[PDB]
Amino acid sequence: RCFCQVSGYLDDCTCDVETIDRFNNYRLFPRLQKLLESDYFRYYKVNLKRPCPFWNEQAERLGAVDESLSEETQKAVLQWTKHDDSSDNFSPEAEYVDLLLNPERYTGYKGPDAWKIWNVIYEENCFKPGLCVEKRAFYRLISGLHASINVHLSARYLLQETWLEKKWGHNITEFQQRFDGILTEGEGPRRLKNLYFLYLIELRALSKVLPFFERPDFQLFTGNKIQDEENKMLLLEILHEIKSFPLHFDENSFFAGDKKEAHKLKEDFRLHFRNISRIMDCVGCFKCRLWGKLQTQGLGTALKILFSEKLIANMPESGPSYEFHLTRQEIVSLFNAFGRISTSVKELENFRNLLQ
Ligand SMILES: Cc1cc2nc3c(=O)[nH]c(=O)nc-3n(C[C@H](O)[C@H](O)[C@H](O)COP(=O)(O)OP(=O)(O)OC[C@H]3O[C@@H](n4cnc5c(N)ncnc54)[C@H](O)[C@@H]3O)c2cc1C
Numbered sequence: 419r420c421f422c423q424v425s426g427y428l429d430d431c432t433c434d435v436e437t438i439d440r441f442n443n444y445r446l447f448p449r450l451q452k453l454l455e456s457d458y459f460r461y462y463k464v465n466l467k468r469p470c471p472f473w474n475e476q477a478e479r480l481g482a483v484d485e486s487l488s489e490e491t492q493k494a495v496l497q498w499t500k501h502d503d504s505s506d507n508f509s510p511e512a513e514y515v516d517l518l519l520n521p522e523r524y525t526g527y528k529g530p531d532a533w534k535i536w537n538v539i540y541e542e543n544c545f546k547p548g549l550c551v552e553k554r555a556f557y558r559l560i561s562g563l564h565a566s567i568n569v570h571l572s573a574r575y576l577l578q579e580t581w582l583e584k585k586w587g588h589n590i591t592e593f594q595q596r597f598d599g600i601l602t603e604g605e606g607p608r609r610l611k612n613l614y615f616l617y618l619i620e621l622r623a624l625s626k627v628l629p630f631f632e633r634p635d636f637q638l639f640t641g642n643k644i645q646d647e648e649n650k651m652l653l654l655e656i657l658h659e660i661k662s663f664p665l666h667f668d669e670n671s672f673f674a675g676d677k678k679e680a681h682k683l684k685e686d687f688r689l690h691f692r693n694i695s696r697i698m699d700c701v702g703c704f705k706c707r708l709w710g711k712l713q714t715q716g717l718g719t720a721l722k723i724l725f726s727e728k729l730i731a732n733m734p735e736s737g738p739s740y741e742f743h744l745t746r747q748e749i750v751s752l753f754n755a756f757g758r759i760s761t762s763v764k765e766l767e768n769f770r771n772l773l774q
Pocket residue numbers: 522523524525526527528529532533535536560561562564565567568571609701705706707709710
């Protein structure tokens with residue numbers, strides 16, 4: 419029996435760490451992995467080439483995005499574009515990228531260039547209560563994302579590189595210096611609580627957005643025809659599992675609709691996330707920018723969903739939905755975003771088992 423207060427004051431979840439760990443690592447994880455490997459989810463439409471709107475070696479190769487798309491896929495994305503063009507949806511620089519050739523991992527991005535980006539994403543914490551207050555909750559979310567990223571580079575580290583062979587795997591020393599309570603004076607365990615906080619918030623969004631995917635009108639459209647329906651089935655099982663986790667949110671949530679207060683806040687969030695997306699256009703490690711764009715777009719969607727209780731409830735049961743919608747890009751980023759957090763939670767079990 420897990421419990422979140424997102425009142426707006428000292429936002430937090432009381433939820434036994436082992437319950438989250440069992441749910442995520444054994445019930446959710448291998449099936450969620452299957453879903454992210456399917457065509458609908460493994461390609462993400464993304465613009466990696468915008469100039470930095472804010473200012474002006476071999477980690478060049480550690481950071482390079484692999485842009486390969488098979489001919490079939492190239493053709494397949496045109497089908498999808500066509501299909502999304504004529505349905506309920508409102509040469510760019512934006513191209514489909516294959517996430518499976520660009521796993522999130524250690525890229526050697528470090529030093530002031532990474533510090534500066536983190537500093538500016540954190541300084542977006544600016545909510546109306548004409549003057550900014552920093553929400554505790556925004557802080558925790560970014561911090562959980564920061565934590566997840568650092569967990570990934572620790573867990574998928576470049577351990578060894580000869581003229582010849584590279585070996586990736588867990589780097590316990592890296593993980594410990596980043597996340598050990600003693601070596602960090604307690605900050606590491608707190609950042610991992612923040613990672614769990616992010617995970618529960620996204621978990622919550624995914625459960626609250628279930629009515630959207632259960633409509634018969636909804637489709638995971640791709641190049642195949644029966645695969646899409648097996649994909650749809652997989653997603654729904656995942657969502658029903660998620661909905662089954664006993665997570666409870668206090669009534670005082672700042673997501674609950676008090677009219678003027680809540681809509682202003684939904685819109686401050688969307689504004690911060692658009693900014694963060696543009697901050698990503700300043701990131702010179704291109705895989706970091708791919709995963710930075712993706713995960714912030716998924717986190718933004720997750721929050722959208724949460725502020726959208728009223729729209730999702732008064733949702734048509736069998737029509738196409740007009741009051742509320744998620745694009746392809748949005749759906750891909752949502753599930754992939756939670757996938758990264760899911761994987762980070764999993765990696766934490768791996769590190770525990772490696773530390774004995
Ligand atoms: C969007 C983005 C994506 C990235 N992707 C990757 C990647 O895929 N692979 C990779 O190797 N590197 C990636 N990086 C860089 C990486 O996250 C680190 O910045 C880098 O490894 C530097 O390590 P660090 O300890 O010096 O700094 P950081 O760990 O970044 O520290 C920056 C500052 O924030 C504090 N801090 C660190 N973590 C937290 C937290 N969870 N909550 C609150 N404060 C915190 C630190 O104490 C320090 O003060 C990415 C960076 C960004 C901005």
